[PDB]
């Protein structure tokens, strides 16, 4: 029940982080998670997130801490990359620890799982709505309810600012 070595998300160990590990697919259950990208350690930009993810042979966990110290993110079946079309598959889900742990799994309504653009990263879709959105600097973020996951707003408000962001891998 510990965050990866070198992670700065140690606040999760007091939020019962095993709630998230239990929601991982049995595919990756039992595999230790490791820190693949950290904004504090490796710099903050969407480009660096893509570059740090290019060598991952594993699904990933996106862990975001906003300026209200609320922690949330996503489990992606595919490492985050630039593409000209949506990717990711049915095991992709969103999660939040605010105000308590909640998971938002695939609803089967659409397959708008992940969209990695040059200037934004994006999860969830349907009617032009985004479940989770991050700008090119991984600074301004947004979270709405989307049909892909039937999620709640992951943080206190729709808009948030990234205080710290990490990507964990299992390979």
Author numbering: 13 to 183
What text does the study give?
Here, the current status of the fully automated ambient-temperature beamline VMXi at Diamond Light Source is described, and a highly efficient pipeline from protein sample to final multi-crystal data analysis and structure determination is shown. The VMXi beamline and its associated PXF within the Research Complex at Harwell offer a highly automated pipeline where researchers provide a suitable protein sample that is used for robotic crystallization, monitoring and subsequent in situ data collection from crystals in crystallization plates or in thin-film sample delivery systems. Here we present illustrative examples of data measured using VMXi from a variety of proteins comprising both conventional crystallographic standards and ‘real world’ user samples. Routine RT data collection provides a useful capability that is highly relevant to studying protein dynamics and ligand binding without the complication of cryo-cooling.
The entire LVPRGS thrombin site was also visible in all three monomers at the N-terminus of Δ57aa-NCOA7 protein, due to the cloning strategy for subcloning into pET15b vector. Comparison between the RT structure and cryo-structures was not feasible due to difference in crystallization condition and space group.
